[PDB]
Amino acid sequence: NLPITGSMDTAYANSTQEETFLTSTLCLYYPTEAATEINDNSWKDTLSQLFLTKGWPTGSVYFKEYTDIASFSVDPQLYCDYNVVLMKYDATLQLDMSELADLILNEWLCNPMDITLYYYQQTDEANKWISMGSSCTIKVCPLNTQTLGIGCLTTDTATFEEVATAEKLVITDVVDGVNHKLDVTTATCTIRNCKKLGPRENVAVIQVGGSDVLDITADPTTAPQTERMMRINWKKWWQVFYTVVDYVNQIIQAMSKRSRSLNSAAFYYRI
Amino acid sequence: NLPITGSMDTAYANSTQEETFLTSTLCLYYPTEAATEINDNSWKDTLSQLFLTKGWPTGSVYFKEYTDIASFSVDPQLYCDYNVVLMKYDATLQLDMSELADLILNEWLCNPMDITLYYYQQTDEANKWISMGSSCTIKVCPLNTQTLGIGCLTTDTATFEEVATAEKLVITDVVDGVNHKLDVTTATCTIRNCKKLGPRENVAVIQVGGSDVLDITADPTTAPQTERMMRINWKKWWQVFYTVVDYVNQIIQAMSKRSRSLNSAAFYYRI
Amino acid sequence: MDVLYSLSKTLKDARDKIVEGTLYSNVSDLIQQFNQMIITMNGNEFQTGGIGNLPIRNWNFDFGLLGTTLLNLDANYVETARNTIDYFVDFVDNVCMDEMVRESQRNGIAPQSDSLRKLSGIKFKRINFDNSSEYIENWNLQNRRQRTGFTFHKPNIFPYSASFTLNRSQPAHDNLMGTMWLNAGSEIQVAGFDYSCAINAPANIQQFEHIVQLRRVLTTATITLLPDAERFSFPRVINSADGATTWYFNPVILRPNNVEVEFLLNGQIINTYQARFGTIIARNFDTIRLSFQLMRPPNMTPAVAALFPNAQPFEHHATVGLTLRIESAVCESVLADASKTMLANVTSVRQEYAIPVGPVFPPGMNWTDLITNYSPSREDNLQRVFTVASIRSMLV
Amino acid sequence: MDVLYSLSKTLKDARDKIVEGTLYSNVSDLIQQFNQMIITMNGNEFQTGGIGNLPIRNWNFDFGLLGTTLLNLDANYVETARNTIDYFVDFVDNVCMDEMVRESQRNGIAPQSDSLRKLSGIKFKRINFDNSSEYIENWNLQNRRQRTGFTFHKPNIFPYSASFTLNRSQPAHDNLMGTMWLNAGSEIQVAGFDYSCAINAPANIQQFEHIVQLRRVLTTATITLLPDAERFSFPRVINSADGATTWYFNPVILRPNNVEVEFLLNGQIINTYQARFGTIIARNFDTIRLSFQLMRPPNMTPAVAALFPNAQPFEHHATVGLTLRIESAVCESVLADASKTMLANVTSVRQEYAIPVGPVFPPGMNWTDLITNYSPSREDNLQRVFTVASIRSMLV
Ligand SMILES: *[C@@H]1O[C@H](CO)[C@@H](O)[C@H](O)[C@H]1NC(C)=O
Ligand SMILES: *[C@@H]1O[C@H](CO)[C@@H](O)[C@H](O)[C@H]1NC(C)=O
Ligand SMILES: [Ca+2]
Ligand SMILES: [Ca+2]
Ligand SMILES: [Ca+2]
Ligand SMILES: [Ca+2]
Ligand SMILES: [Ca+2]
Ligand SMILES: [Ca+2]
Ligand SMILES: [Ca+2]
Ligand SMILES: [Ca+2]
Ligand SMILES: [Zn+2]
């Protein structure tokens, strides 16, 4: 990172939309019920040809399927340069979907949390505990300077306070500056101490149906809808995919290249 | 592609090896027999830890396994920024080793061929026909200027001249300027008309045991033996992997980034 | 130059003072000077023009002297004087125009037109009399190698530059820290912006700096410093430094903190004002250093607290601005300013006669290019042409 | 300057001609000039300044005239003359040194030291006599705005620059096409290299171009042009343009083909030479355009064909050179050259007395920096100091 000096009289360059469409890849994540309703084995080819009409080279649009929001929330691996997640809306899962967005619309720096030997705390409002697995049931016992527990006994987990049960993904936020003993099913869950660095610009979430319920910020005073959080009413999935294809330029305009240099181990679908 | 003007007094920068390892990744391709002899369920983990001692961050080194040279030759996909292929030497598979090395050490620009409709010819010395699949059998019938076979009958394919039998990968080089009718088992193998653009500088091949027998150029008058074609003597595979880990600095020094802009969206690892 | 100025001054005084009914006592010395000018110029042939579309004109001087025995001037005397005055004024105007359109690199201070070079001969020094105008006075001081001084109201010392620097940037341009400025003429507006409102800053303070180098030393400068930059206080879409994309700026203005304006000469702090606004005096300087701070308000009302959240997205971007206007200054070099017209006169003469671009000045006499690269040769030529323009303005 | 030169010339002539036993007829005019100098200088106080570590020195002149009335000069005459000449020579050397260490951005052709400014008064013009040296002759021509000419053996016209241009390149730096050059003093060595040896070129020909834009116009220049550039004909490891890495150069030298040396003035072809080597004459130019070609040999013996395969790797890289030496030339401006000592003298005087860096010349009188930015102000100051240096070298 170096200072960048620019002249306000500089001329705008031509549109780079065609070049980025040519040199980038698009990943679409949709629920399995979409494929079920569409009921066509060649719909991937059809959408690829339509995207080609929109400018994307054949083979650069990758279609990925997930069973549901809860299943997809277990270590979501976003591959392409541009990722669009068609997330079905369920009034009962408002938190979970929000968490999923909170997981994929932001960059997270995470380190392992070996709870069974160590005591942990959250240093600042950017710190959270992200737990992912088949079943994440997390109980918390706040502690104090004398190392005793408040309304909890370290020797009896039954007295721990319940913050998660049977979760595929959950973001736990506790009071900062306080040590907590943790009890999570390590067999079916992995908990990580994470810091949200900032927005993840290459991931857009399109909520299919419902209303604006997403809250990607733990602060109760903010519920910001960024340009990467779209929301479309629906009755047929074919119309949903047609509107995704037709307004692909608008969707990618709302997104930007990831720009982060990572330390992780994930594959990517790039050109 | 613009001219670059440089001064012969510009100060050398510091070593980029540390940041290169922290920002790049290493795919190591080994045969199945290597894992069989190692006889450990966690040799990947210890090799990754040793690589970390050598500088690479955890999860950056990828370990891919192939049954043998023939099977690996069937459309090999190279994922990491730096690819090292440990190829065992067999005195009876020199041409197959050479063809694999040619395919993965050079950059190729390929287009499909329709052998059942049109006749084909090779324009210049860089033009070849690469056929790969489960079983490639290619027979050729050179035609004269009256589109009539020479020493072959266009109607009868039994008179055709056999250039490949049951191969999994074969690079066919015929006389340039002559139209050839091709009889290829398209049901089990695909043939593509390709041009050699240049070297793939991100792929190194380490020949385990044997002699210098590789020939990555069809010209009889050249056997280059470039700096990306190493050879070692061995008795045990653990020694081979320890040598690869210890001298990974030299291996990566012998390689450079791919530098080619691709029109194809494939699966890669990139940190 | 002094002889040309003296011709112009004699002609102007003749126009002003040789009027019907005036006592000869009021013009006796002027009439003597005028007759001396006639005597000196008589029998001399001059040629002006021949550059661009400026026409070649030949000038011959064979004139009679003015009478000296009148008690009061009458109509006949005034018309007799006016014929000669008209011819001489035309000659002086053409000589000035011929000199204004020419330039030289090595010796641009010296006369370039053949007419003015001929007028620089010794015999013409008899024409020379009172050199009282500011520009001719500075010309004579320069020729004597004395300290020169030009007073400028709103000196045009800053070349036009609307620019920005991003000290913190991302490809999406949503968390931007930096500063944007306009330098134009005698005016400097600067504005440091933080999109996060310095929430993650060490002491919740973001330090902004702006250094402006003046191409010439300014002395005895009166400046007005104001705590807001109205130019960068409204929302705007701004090109990226490479022009590849455009980013959004949505200012919300907070008062600048620890404002410190330093006026430096050769890297030495001459003047320093902290938290001082209104009229200040910079006595001698060539560089201006404006250092200010964005301090996050420790206490916020619910609306203000709503403006600035803990983390992104940042929709309202904190901005602190400074305005610095040089109202008057003194410079040892010639500059275009708001009150004078020499630059306008030279540019007008060069444009009207389609003077080809020379090796000294930028095409079209563009001031931004001239002041950006204000070399000593350009200063010589500019002083020469500005002095000639001032001489011409006495008559035309 | 002409008075200072005349003092130095009179003193040098006195030292060379006032010798024991010489006929007075050999020195009569010299004795008259010397006595005129003594009369003009008597009663005048001079001070050579204290710039840097140059000591403040005071000079008083009260000398008797050199005698007449001798048929042959004797020892007494020569001894008296030697005393006077020694004092005068010390004064002249100190004045020259004081002038050599000073500079002004504007009016840098004018005298800078107080002693030389005093000597520029009318009362010392009597000292002025024969101005025959090349530098004083050109000084007088410049003062009159006449054509100036300085003859240089091996003129130092090219600032040092060892650079390269990669027209075809890639991160591995194994298949490179481009040019590398050294421009230093009066010499240009250029070399166009192709790693593929023009295997894939349109006609197995690779075109190489090198344009060197001289910062002053050279006239009547004799230039040796040789085919090979020995400086770029051996294996090298060269930094990358940005310094990130190093690439390898393994030249094999082929003769340049279709050599084309153009000497251009103001973008107009003045001289052209095709397939010409040895001495060539460029009569008037400010730019040199060298066009050469690497032609792949149509026929190659097995050893040659082994070096140039159809495809990569390319281990022997085909290079075509060109050497261009300006043996002598004429320039209207002053330049450092191989035969003269003016630059060395000025630099030595500045370094010996620890003269602080001024606003005109680069620190240390660095010639590369000087001629890279050879501005009119720099040209005036440099001509002044070089003329003073030559005047001093007449005596010191
Ligand atoms: C940009 O678009 C214009 C408008 O057609 C075209 O002329 C130009 O070549 C394009 N490219 C650039 C680099 O300006
Ligand atoms: C490079 O290395 C040198 C010495 O090893 C060190 O002083 C310097 O800080 C390093 N980094 C850079 C950017 O030069
Ligand atoms: Ca959940
Ligand atoms: Ca409890
Ligand atoms: Ca917390
Ligand atoms: Ca919230
Ligand atoms: Ca084979
Ligand atoms: Ca046959
Ligand atoms: Ca062939
Ligand atoms: Ca070969
Ligand atoms: Zn930007």
Ligand SMILES: [Zn+2]
């Ligand atoms: Zn010599």
Ligand SMILES: [Zn+2]
């Ligand atoms: Zn390079």
